[PDB]
Amino acid sequence: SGFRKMAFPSGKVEGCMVQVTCGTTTLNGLWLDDVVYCPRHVICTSEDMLNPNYEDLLIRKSNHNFLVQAGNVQLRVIGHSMQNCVLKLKVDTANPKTPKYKFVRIQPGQTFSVLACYNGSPSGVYQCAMRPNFTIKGSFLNGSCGSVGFNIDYDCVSFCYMHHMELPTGVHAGTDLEGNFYGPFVDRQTAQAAGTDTTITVNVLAWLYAAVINGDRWFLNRFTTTLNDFNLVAMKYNYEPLTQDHVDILGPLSAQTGIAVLDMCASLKELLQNGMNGRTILGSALLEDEFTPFDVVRQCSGVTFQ
């Protein structure tokens, strides 16, 4: 019992974090086999930040312009290349702590763990979600660039996010590990702003199912709804549309609890209308949207508290 914002154990990622320095700029890199991955903006100077030409900046660098430090050990850079917005530094040593891993690009609504790092050293771990507006609501200070997000379902580390920048509202933007940004953002200082964000409806529904599994039913009601009527209401509260794909992926939770998906949708409609009237759900007075259906099944019992 209980229900927490739960991250993956971070040790397999800690063993890959290194410090990368170019010029006066230091940030974090990810050391996998004989490659170090980091944000390409490590090669920018103070006058280059509005409109850097990264191809022109990189051709002026030699391998020995990049200082890579793994704990106390300096690694020797023997090659470099750029892939989209990520720099790849080939080093002369394969990381002996490289885990089984892959690179995955995620979709909005998906969750992942973040290992926040400074100067190549880990600070803390927390859970995040890719928001519908392609930002993440992280906790990141100056020097955190190159920190990564990941999942570890089944002993393989899936890296899905590398941190690049903070936007004016205090939320965060970055890339997959192939260097492609999430959303319309660019690694330039030119003015950029997140779009209006929305609530991840399928995740709210997953979390209401988690509450039922853990023994709470006060918010249920005798009603149902059609899918289209639900979406007409939910969008008036800045909720994302619920698709038939979402209905399908909620099937297992629906079967475990005996509550049809569109019946739970009718409960959510009433909660938006009424509030909680001084009650809480799983320790929150707001509707939580950063737990996915997969997360709920990973954390909750397979036996409903009836």
Residue 223 in the binding site for Cl ion (CB under 5 A): yes
Looking at the Cβ atoms of 141 and 193, the one nearer to ligand 9M5 is 141
Instruction: Figure out which of the listed residues 59, 73, 193, 303 binds a copy of itself, where binding follows CB under 8 A.
Output: 303
Choices 42-50, 64-72, 87-95, 168-176; region in contact with a copy of itself by CB under 8 A:
168-176
Looking at the Cβ atoms of 238 and 301, the one nearer to ligand 9M5 is 301
3-class secondary structure per residue, 25-64: EEEEEEEECCEEEEEHHHHCCHHHCCCCCHHHHHHCCCHH
Three-class SS of residue 6? coil
Instruction: Figure out which of the listed residues 59, 73, 141, 191 binds ligand 9M5, where binding follows CB under 6 A.
Output: 141
19-78: which residues touch ligand 9M5 (CB under 6 A)?
41, 49
Residue 280 in the binding site for a copy of itself (CB under 8 A): yes
Residue 214 in the binding site for a copy of itself (CB under 8 A): yes
99-138: which residues touch a copy of itself (CB under 8 A)?
115-119, 121-128, 137-138
What are the structure tokens assigned to 109, written together? 């609504």
**Which of these, 291, 8, 33, 4, lies nearest to 158 by C-alpha position?**
8
What are the structure tokens assigned to 229, written together? 């009527």
Three-class SS of residue 250? coil
Choices 66-74, 99-107, 262-270, 277-285; region in contact with a copy of itself by CB under 8 A:
277-285
Q: Give the C-alpha separation, 214 to 56, whole Å.
A: 57
Looking at the Cβ atoms of 144 and 231, the one nearer to Na ion is 231
**Long-range pairs, 298-304, Cβ under 8 A, ≥24:** 298/153, 299/3, 299/4, 299/6, 299/210, 300/3, 300/210, 300/213, 300/214, 301/1, 301/213, 302/256, 304/212, 304/213, 304/256, 304/257, 304/258
Looking at the Cβ atoms of 16 and 264, the one nearer to a copy of itself is 16
What are the structure tokens assigned to 103, written together? 């690179």
Q: Give the C-alpha separation, 43 to 299, whole Å.
A: 42
Choices 64-72, 103-111, 182-190, 278-286; region in contact with ligand 9M5 by CB under 6 A:
182-190
Instruction: Figure out which of the listed residues 64, 71, 302, 306 binds a copy of itself, where binding follows CB under 8 A.
Output: 302
Question: Which residues are tagged catalytic?
Answer: 41, 145
Q: What's phi and psi for 117, nearest 5 deg? A: -130, 150
Instruction: Figure out which of the listed residues 145, 148, 250, 264 binds ligand 9M5, where binding follows CB under 6 A.
Output: 145
**Which of these, 13, 8, 207, lies nearest to 126 by C-alpha position?**
8
125-184: which residues touch Cl ion (CB under 5 A)?
none
Residue 285 in the binding site for a copy of itself (CB under 8 A): yes
Q: Give the C-alpha separation, 3 to 41, whole Å.
A: 39
For residue 105, the minimal CB distance to Na ion (Å) is 36
Which x/- pattern over 15-54 shows residues binding a copy of itself (rule: CB under 8 A)? x---------------------------------------
Farthest-apart Cα atoms in the chain, separation: 69
Interacting residues with a copy of itself (CB under 8 A)? 1-12, 14-15, 115-119, 121-128, 137-141, 143-144, 166, 170-172, 214-215, 280, 283-286, 299-305
Interacting residues with ligand 9M5 (CB under 6 A)? 41, 49, 140-145, 164-166, 187-189
Interacting residues with Cl ion (CB under 5 A)? 223-224
